[PDB]
Amino acid sequence: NVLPTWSLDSNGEMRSRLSLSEVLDSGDLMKFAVDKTGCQFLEKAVKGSLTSYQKFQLFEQVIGRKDDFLKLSTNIFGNYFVQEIIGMSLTTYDDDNIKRQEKLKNFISSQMTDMCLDKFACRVIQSSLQNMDLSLACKLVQALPRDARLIAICVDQNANHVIQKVVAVIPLKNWEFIVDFVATPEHLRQICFDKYGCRVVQTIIEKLTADSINVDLTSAAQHLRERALQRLMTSVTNRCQELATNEYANYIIQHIVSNDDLAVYRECIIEKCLMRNLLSLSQEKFASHVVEKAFLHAPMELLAEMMDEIFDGYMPHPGTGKDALDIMMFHQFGNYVVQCMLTICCDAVSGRRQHANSFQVWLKKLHSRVTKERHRLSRFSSGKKMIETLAGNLRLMRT
RNA sequence: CUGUGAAUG
């Protein structure tokens, strides 16, 4: 352990009869907070009844000294106690509440970048952002780096939650530079192709979309949100080809297709990169889900083609005579697309979806195809799921 | 014959 000598028994361990006031008066609370046993003692002690003097001491010794606060926030054990004391200070409304919040804001702003990338200090940052004064939380947001480190924070396993929290609890006026920074084409690729940066971008997109819980307050707020949304959507749709096939970015595309409030952009995504490539994209591991979402959420006018491309939109193979449907139906990733196409037709002819005769024609074509090869499809689980619903890249030449 | 995305004691 790292406990001070005064608080140890003759075996070198922490004394059993120890009180919180002794630790506070000794001025060695720091050594206790970074220790595994001492921090547990402190968390036990502060959970009881505390006098105003003890609250004052805790505030000053935990969140009142910059170097001490930074050392505790970046500690594996100390960060929990720091969050506890932060919440306690915010919930204590005396003549020093705003002053303690000001000191907290300054302490965190002086090391923002390094604290976001810290596995323990980012917890402190998030815990402050959602409970501290909004006036000072917005000021905290402005300490975020603007150079390449902002990419790091976005792609960091821990620091991405900080950016998503900022997006969740801070008005867009204060983090619009983040939208503009992600919208950069050289940054959008790096951030979207990352495991956690993709979550960051999807969270930003979801916040900039007006819906039931995202209700605009003023005309200025609505205009700001919609202009930021348009700026980000142009960047996304200019390189939607490489995003829809990426192992992580594809989700983003799916979102823009699944969300009915992004209809416009959805349709653009279908016409710019999806169309004339339904086969090869249906044969992709990650883009096949994008094709499924497109089939599920395309307007009737675009769904009409999306069917006609797979039906009569590719030249059959001159060697085997297989068309698009035959190649996709036996494909490891395209059979899910075929099942989705079957499902939309089975749902429209029943009453789940509303040109009604075109669905009859499409379902009759697909039903013919499935009934024809009942053997091979019965050999697989995909065809097993097809028949119940009714009850390696191989491309082709465009027609 | 099934197919892909979040970090502390």
Curated annotation (Swiss-Prot):
GO terms for biological process: germline cell cycle switching, mitotic to meiotic cell cycle; negative regulation of translation; olfactory learning; oocyte growth; positive regulation of gene expression; post-transcriptional regulation of gene expression; sex differentiation. The chain holds residues 164 to 611 of 614 of the full protein. This is Fem-3 mRNA-binding factor 1. Pumilio repeats lie at residues 22-60, 61-100, 106-142, 143-179, 180-219, 235-271, 273-308, 320-354. It comes from the Eukaryota. The keyword Cytoplasm applies. Residues 1-391 form the PUM-HD domain. It is found in: Cytoplasm. Residues 120-399 are annotated as: Binding to gld-3 isoform A. GO terms for molecular function: mRNA 3'-UTR binding. GO terms for cellular component: cytoplasm; germ cell nucleus; nucleus; perinuclear region of cytoplasm. Expressed specifically in the germline (at protein level). Interacts (via C-terminus) with gld-3 isoform A in an RNA-independent manner. Fbf-1 and fbf-2 are >90% identical on both nucleotide and protein sequence level. Experimental approaches often do not distinguish between the two genes, which are collectively referred to as fbf and are considered to be functionally redundant. RNA-binding protein that binds to the consensus sequence 5'-UGUGCCAUA-3' in mRNA 3'-UTRs. Involved in the control of stem cells and sex determination in the C.elegans hermaphrodite germline. May also play a role in the hermaphrodite germline proliferation and oogenesis. Binds specifically to the regulatory region of fem-3 3'-UTR and mediates the sperm/oocyte switch. Negatively regulates gld-3 expression, possibly by directly binding to two sites within the 3'-UTR of gld-3 isoform b. Keywords: Cytoplasm, Developmental protein, Differentiation, Repeat, RNA-binding, Sexual differentiation. Its main location: cytoplasm.
